[PDB]
Amino acid sequence: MRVPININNALARVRDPLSIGGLKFPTTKEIQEAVAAIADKFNQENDLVDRFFPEDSTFASELELYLLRTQDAEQTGMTFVHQVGSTSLPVEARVAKVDLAKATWSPLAFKESRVWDEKEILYLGRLADEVQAGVINEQIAESLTWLMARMRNRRRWLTWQVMRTGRITIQPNDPYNPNGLKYVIDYGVTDIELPLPQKFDAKDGNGNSAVDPIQYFRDLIKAATYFPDRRPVAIIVGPGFDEVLADNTFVQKYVEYEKGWVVGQNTVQPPREVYRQAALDIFKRYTGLEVMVYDKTYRDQDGSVKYWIPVGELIVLNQSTGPVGRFVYTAHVAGQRNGKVVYATGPYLTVKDHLQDDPPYYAIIAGFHGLPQLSGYNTEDFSFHRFKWLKYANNVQSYLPPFPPKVEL
């Protein structure tokens, strides 16, 4: 929604034509005009978790999973001891066993509407010039595009709610829940937070820190050599990760080793330029995992500009970097075709033109049905660990530049 004005016609019109000043005659002057367009550059859309699962359709309303597990008996049990002139002895009884399990699924629902009454359909034009009542065809077509952006925003909110907590929680006192509904949807995410009581920039004592991240993320790979779904593969971090590594006094000795920087001889100790410029590659080579930086930002309701992945926090992936999950579109009643009801999945957009009745109007309804769904649990013990969250430092904000406040006319 922009203001319906004419730009050039309004600059040439906010100029008093019949006004004189304290000098009681009209005076000479020179006038320059300029046009500015104020936007918020630092409120971007969380397009990270769009790739962490694609979208799918099912034309059903519930999905159920069945798992059948078998456990045979082992060929163990050494042999019984004999003497030559006697009889044999019988062998013990073994046991085999099978179990079977079940899980379900069912989606959510959301739709909304908007209506335009009879006055504003033909009683609005521009503000500088005059227009023969056709600005509503411009303003509906933006609001038609806006309703598609609502559902794309609603999909990402549920998606990030799983990615951050593994818990869809909807409360009545909530933005964009006027109907006052209740959902607490607990997915089966096991141990979403990695423990780290001294983070990386604790720096207890004089100047020496406490925890080596090259050793910490190598400790995790060592403790999951026989847990193949549990060793880390990549890490996605916010902006200020190199500035934690460069002030660490453990990682620094890795940087000095690969360049021969003994401080007492050979060199005076360098500044933090190259001492941080090589902090990524020495982290990537000695932990073996990938690092992706996601510094994309949004603006808070009240405060300053925040990051999507928060400041002193990162995510840790596991056995694959591929799609962790799936977003499912379920069925919805579309229009009939030949007396039979026809269905459809995905976001829909229905037009209800009542432009010929006694007060005419025009209405649009938009929504869909669906919910995210995780990929697949561990069959042995029913656990899910593909992503985990780590709070790695406390004072990353002091290593980050500030932001412009939101300009508001």
């Binding site: 798992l67 062998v91 085999a96 066993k97 079940k102 959902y183 949807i185 607990d186």
Partner: protein
């Protein structure tokens, strides 16, 4: 709450049958079962189990088998054998009682409150007057004699 996580439904355990000495020999006769005995909790469980049966020598239920009351000296004096790996008690009421075999001591429990695969100490204690002979951790019995 719109998603149920995995929970198990079926629980099937398939054990093997009660082993016995090949060279000692078999002798088994089918007897009728006592209807007053709740035979459900005697054949309950997937575990390999044997148990002793007595017989009513007289009265209105004569010739019917019932599990041996070890606290009764009359039921100890009337033991006739063991039931090995119990049958369909619901479709039929005539059990095959083994009168002569050689069974390890880990597979014979009298009490329902007795763990499987463990020796029943009440059976070992009364094995002199139950005509049981414990040799090499095995019960030897023959009730034809």
């Amino acid at each position: 709450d719109k998603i149920q996580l995995f929970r198990t439904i079926g629980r099937v355990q398939y054990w093997e049958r009660v082993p016995r000495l090949h060279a000692y020999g078999v002798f088994a006769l089918p007897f009728p079962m006592d209807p007053d005995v709740e035979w459900g909790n005697w054949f309950a469980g997937p575990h390999p189990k044997a148990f002793l049966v007595s017989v009513h020598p007289s009265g209105p239920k004569a010739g019917h088998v019932y599990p041996t009351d070890l606290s009764d000296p009359d039921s100890v004096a009337n033991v006739i054998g063991m039931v090995l790996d119990g049958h369909d008690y619901e479709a039929d009421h005539n059990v095959t009682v083994t009168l002569r075999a050689a069974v390890p001591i880990e597979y014979v429990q009298q009490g329902i409150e007795a763990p499987p695969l463990q020796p029943d100490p009440a059976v070992l204690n009364a094995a002199p007057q139950l005509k049981l002979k414990v040799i090499k951790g095995h019960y030897f019995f023959d009730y034809t004699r």
